[PDB]
């Protein structure tokens, strides 16, 4: 089982740091955690998504690979992966005790709350993903690398540098698999199971964008950065 080469240890350092610097209340999200009590539950939800989107943008900008792409590609990739990454970041903070996910590193929500907030079935998918990820014990590095894989999706429509984005994805997937080899998780077939979690996150991304098209509720009720990334 090959382990990370020197240059992959370097890329792992870079992508882990980008994640840790833009991940809300890193490793102090549970003690600093409040709970919440209809286009009013949606209201409470839309006033808090803007900083979650802002952090994803911030994460991408700390990837030199991302910064080398032309702005029109950068916009398209962020539109594609933004809800996938906020969803992963929320799912890795599933608390089995309270049965909550954590948004913006301080707000605990239940399945029912997120659903009433307008996510519909996507709420059930994010919670099932969180429950199945408790036994995966993903560290900052594995989360950062999943995020980089989702960001560098060559298949988003209207991209100019399809080939280059594909090569970045391949570099991240190889380093990630090598790191996974090194970490020797106590879960059979770990890497195949992780590729299936990527697929789950991509379905969350495509269902999220689908649901947005269906919730024309006046658009002005929704924050601008949230109607841009759909």
């Amino acid at each position: 089982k090959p382990e990370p080469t020197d240059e992959e240890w370097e890329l792992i350092k870079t992508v882990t740091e980008a994640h840790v610097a833009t991940n809300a209340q890193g490793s102090h999200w549970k003690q600093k955690r409040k709970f919440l009590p209809d286009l009013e539950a949606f209201s409470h939800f839309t006033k808090i998504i803007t900083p979650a989107i802002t952090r994803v943008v911030d994460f991408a900008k700390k990837l030199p690979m991302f910064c080398e792409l032309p702005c029109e590609d950068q916009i398209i990739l962020l539109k594609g992966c933004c809800m996938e990454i906020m969803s992963l970041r929320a799912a890795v903070r599933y608390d089995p005790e309270s049965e909550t996910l954590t948004l913006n590193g301080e707000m605990a929500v239940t399945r029912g709350q997120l659903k009433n907030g307008g996510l519909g079935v996507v709420s059930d998918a994010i919670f099932d993903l969180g429950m199945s990820l408790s036994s995966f014990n993903l560290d900052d590095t594995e989360v950062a690398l999943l995020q980089a894989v989702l960001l560098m999706s060559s298949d988003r429509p209207g991209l100019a540098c399809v080939e280059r984005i594909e090569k970045y994805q391949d570099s991240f997937l190889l380093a990630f698999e090598h790191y996974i080899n090194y970490r020797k998780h106590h879960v059979t077939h770990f890497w195949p199971k992780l590729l299936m979690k990527v697929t789950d996150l991509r379905m969350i991304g495509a269902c999220h964008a689908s649901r947005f098209l269906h919730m024309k509720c006046p658009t002005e009720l929704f924050p601008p950065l949230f109607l841009e990334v759909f």
């Binding site: 802002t54 943008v57 900008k61 702005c71 916009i75 962020l78 539109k79 950065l225 841009e228 990334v229």
Partner: peptide, 11 residues
């Protein structure tokens, strides 16, 4: 369109 994304992206 994507006027705010473009703002946050350039810096």
């Amino acid at each position: 369109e994507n006027a705010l994304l473009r703002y946050l992206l350039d810096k």
